[PDB]
Ligand binder design. Sequence first.
Ligand SMILES: Nc1nc2c(ncn2[C@@H]2O[C@H](COP(=O)(O)OP(=O)(O)OP(=O)(O)O)[C@@H](O)[C@H]2O)c(=O)[nH]1
Ligand SMILES: [Ca+2]
Ligand SMILES: [Ca+2]
Length: 1203
Amino acid sequence: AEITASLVKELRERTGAGMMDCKKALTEANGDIELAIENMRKSGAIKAAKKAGNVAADGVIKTKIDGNYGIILEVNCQTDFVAKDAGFQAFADKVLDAAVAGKITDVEVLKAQFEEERVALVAKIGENINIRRVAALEGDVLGSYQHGARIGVLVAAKGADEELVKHIAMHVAASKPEFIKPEDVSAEVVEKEYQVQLDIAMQSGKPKEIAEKMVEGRMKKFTGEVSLTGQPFVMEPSKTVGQLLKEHNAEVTGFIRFEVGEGIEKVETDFAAEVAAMSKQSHMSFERTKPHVNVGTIGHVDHGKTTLTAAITTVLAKTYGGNTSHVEYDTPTRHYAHVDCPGHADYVKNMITGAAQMDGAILVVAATDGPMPQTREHILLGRQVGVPYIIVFLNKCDMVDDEELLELVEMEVRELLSQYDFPGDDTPIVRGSALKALEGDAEWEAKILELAGFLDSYIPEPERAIDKPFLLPIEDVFSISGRGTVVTGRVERGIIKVGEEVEIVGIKETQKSTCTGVEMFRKLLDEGRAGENVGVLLRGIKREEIERGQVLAKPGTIKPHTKFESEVYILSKDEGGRHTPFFKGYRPQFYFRTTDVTGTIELPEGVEMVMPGDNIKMVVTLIHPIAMDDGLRFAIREGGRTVGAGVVAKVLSGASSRNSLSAQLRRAANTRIEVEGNLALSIANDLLLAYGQSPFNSEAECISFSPRFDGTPDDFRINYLKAEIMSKYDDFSLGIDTEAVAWEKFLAAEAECALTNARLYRPDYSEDFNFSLGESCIHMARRKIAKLIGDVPSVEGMLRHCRFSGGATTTNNRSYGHPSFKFALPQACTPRALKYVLALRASTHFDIRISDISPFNKAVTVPKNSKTDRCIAIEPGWNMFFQLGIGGILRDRLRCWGIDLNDQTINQRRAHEGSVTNNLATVDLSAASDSISLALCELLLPPGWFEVLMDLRSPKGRLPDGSVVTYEKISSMGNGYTFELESLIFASLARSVCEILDLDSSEVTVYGDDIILPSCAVPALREVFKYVGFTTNTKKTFSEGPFRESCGKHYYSGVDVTPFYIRHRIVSPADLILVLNNLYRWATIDGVWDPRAHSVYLKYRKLLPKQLQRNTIPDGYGDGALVGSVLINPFAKNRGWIRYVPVITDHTRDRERAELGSYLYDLFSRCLSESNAIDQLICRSNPTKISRSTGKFDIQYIACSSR
RNA sequence: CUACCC
RNA sequence: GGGUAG
Ligand SMILES: Nc1nc2c(ncn2[C@@H]2O[C@H](COP(=O)(O)OP(=O)(O)OP(=O)(O)O)[C@@H](O)[C@H]2O)c(=O)[nH]1
Ligand SMILES: [Ca+2]
Ligand SMILES: [Ca+2]
């Protein structure tokens, strides 16, 4: 205590400075007013210049116009909350209309003209409030659209008005052009990239007017992009602005656009990172049913929330015990989760998208200075985001020596709470210092204990989801003879016991029914707890009365509505959403619980465009009701892709494509086209000519032409595609060929496999003397295998990996391939493999139908080359179930050698390296999966594994030739684990060939047969393989070349030469859409054609029907249409502020699904679920439907985007 | 159930 | 069979 705490307030409410900055500027002011304030006025610029190592990343833009004189601004702070407050507003508004009177262009002018007032606020607040930039534009008619606060645009036109300059400023705001015309560039910024790409291009070997053409066209596009001219108007992205302008009676001159924090780059601060470092300094000086409470810390920057969250960690470590950017710590009763609230607009994008909700925020305010002016925006963010409860902590109280003065600050926070309808009178306020508690000062450590003593009490215990009014999302429905109607899904909330009454509410009149019973897969329980994945039986109600997305809750618990107010975030461009804003008539689908629902939206008063990366309040009125209550997270899909997220706020009162077009296309889609011969051979020929290269003379040369491996990448690429494109043309006329040849090989794949299987059974040469390279590797591989594998497949890892999947079984066929027709229909087991199926049968109360019991798999033939076919083999559907389980445990496990098979990227990326590096070699075997000996496999795998592989495998096979064979190969293609095994085998050995040569085994990467290793190892790997039986595809194995190929990617000196193949006979316009598209990808860079390919594209493009030449789509959307610019598509209609397009689909008459087997599978899926932009968790899995390919083509409509 | 591939 | 995007 020094002087009275009383009229220190006289300082504050006449000044606005700190509390102790007021008392301490009074202790050396002799109890005087003015001369105390003059200390502040002079010692306010000292702190104001203390602000310079505080980067100002936030702020506002403000804009003004008079008659036809317009001005923008970039006055900016370092925090949202400040910018939105009535102070930063008042100054920045003032400093804006100061440019209205005086056309101030030099920022220096007004940056100085208010420097003495710029300090009046940073002394009041505590942030580097500095003006960044200013500019202004004069003209005829100049309009300005202000996007809330963050983006300001000033644009000047001619012949235009508010029915325009508004709308185009919106585009400038939206599209962000740097220039205005393609002619508005310097022949230096142009001849920069014009000499930057010309080498990039010419290095390839492409002539003068190829590279020159290509580059000029690409730069013509590059210019065209930023070209406000060459820019698709944001409200009509069909016509360009420049086109919109000339088509209008008008012509703009100039434009100014500011955002906030351009270039103000900075470095990204994590919270949970630096707080583990703020702690690390002070470091050196049963009950798991305990609730989760999401707390947040909120307050000024320099009041050091940072410092306090740290104390609330260490002092809680000291005492009890112990979405990233959050800290997980405990308390003896509860377990919290704690986050920082720096950005108002980034906390909404946390609550809305649900990355971090709030069950109670903590209000940090340094007692030294008390409530800052912008704090009412912190408290405002609470009663804006609907935070339930609020605890306040006054940090740094040692910096006050008078309690009579501390009690005065609670006044100025308790009344600041109460303005915002928070229990200010009855709200907890802790007085202490974190700084003292970081140390070891337990007198002040009792304050964090007094604070954490409030989170334990003043925050209510979260209604644990079990305890909430029962509710289940209807995910799918089955009509079982014997059970009636049954729905499956994970129950969201509550418990459902057998018999209770439930409503079935969703779209129809909220009907009601009763739980005839509940069941899982193994258990057939009687109560269904929340969080569990179940199937509930309903009576007196059939399937057709129950849709999906319906809920299944207690009666009256939740009513169905269709009108509600919500708040949503829209995914930014870089986040996945639209790269285009929408306007008044947005009509998306609203993905709710399990189903998508379309719907219109209103914009609140005064907002007219919203862009990717926005928060926004809106009112949603969807086409037909869904059951809802406040707190329901719904994403927002546009044609299957999630471009928004949002939660319902308040539930309310309640309330163009040409069909002739689609039908015109459907007509033409089925238009079989007629050619005077082989269209392919024609196209490929007329293409080779298009490149100087000598064409095919006969139809034999298509597959007997071997390329050359010299020449420029260009001389290659083409020469390669030549030898490659035709390879797979099945329909070759006097192709005196067959599939018999496929069989002829499969005979060696056992005939050799015989030879090895045998000679692989006597490794004692004669007497010990000779020591072979193979045997050694096997020995090494064997050891290596078992460290990776196990002595036997863990049933744990076995059951949660086995599945019914795909297509043909011995008992089924491609029609009856979908998994439900495996539980419905009995599948074949195999003698040895019986025991497992029996396990399944005591593993559930369901029906496990074994049809025949035979050791036979059907060996057949599927098409491959034009010179041969495959000889896959269709396994006994039960063997396949387990084979797929051991194929999965042998794959998740195979990932420790750095082998990922659900990612063939990491094996083709390395083909890239190899093509340049020359130290990596791609390899290929002749009959890969087929030449794996029953002998070899025994020598490597553990005996316990080699059992389970002899058990599941099919030992004998019946041919179409009637004749049986007994497998020398352990496993054939089509077998349910063969891929993973041959991976692991090949990987095993490459790696042994590595250790054996003092080489990193970690440099070995295998994908099935597509194994990649160090180039030096190859002749050893080759000599190993020669021994272990396999034989090496010299033609496809590449070590010394400039060329590497792997996982379907081909490379030549780091350069992409992946060809495309013309498989089957081109006939329907879908087969020409397809070929024209592969040639489009193969010869384009960003919609910019390699000229001499464009020639044939354009030519054979004429072959398609008139409408089927203009119907373009972006790449990566299918082949239902030619890829091109969808901005052009005449058939593309603008529905609901989202563009929709028509693409060729295959026709499907629907069919009957096995309600039994579909249900059997749906609940088997939940057994496999249960034992295995942060918002895709919302979206669930799909019901089983079956459909049959008719032959006709239908036209389906989808959703699209520019680029 | 369309493309790409091991 | 298996990935990968539809
Ligand atoms: N089970 C199964 N595996 C396949 C099939 N197609 C390709 N593969 C895998 O792809 C690997 C290599 O395929 P390819 O390189 O095309 O054929 P390959 O039989 O191994 O030998 P070649 O084509 O003669 O060089 C094989 O080991 C197979 O495991 C198939 O239809 N069924
Ligand atoms: Ca191969
Ligand atoms: Ca290969």
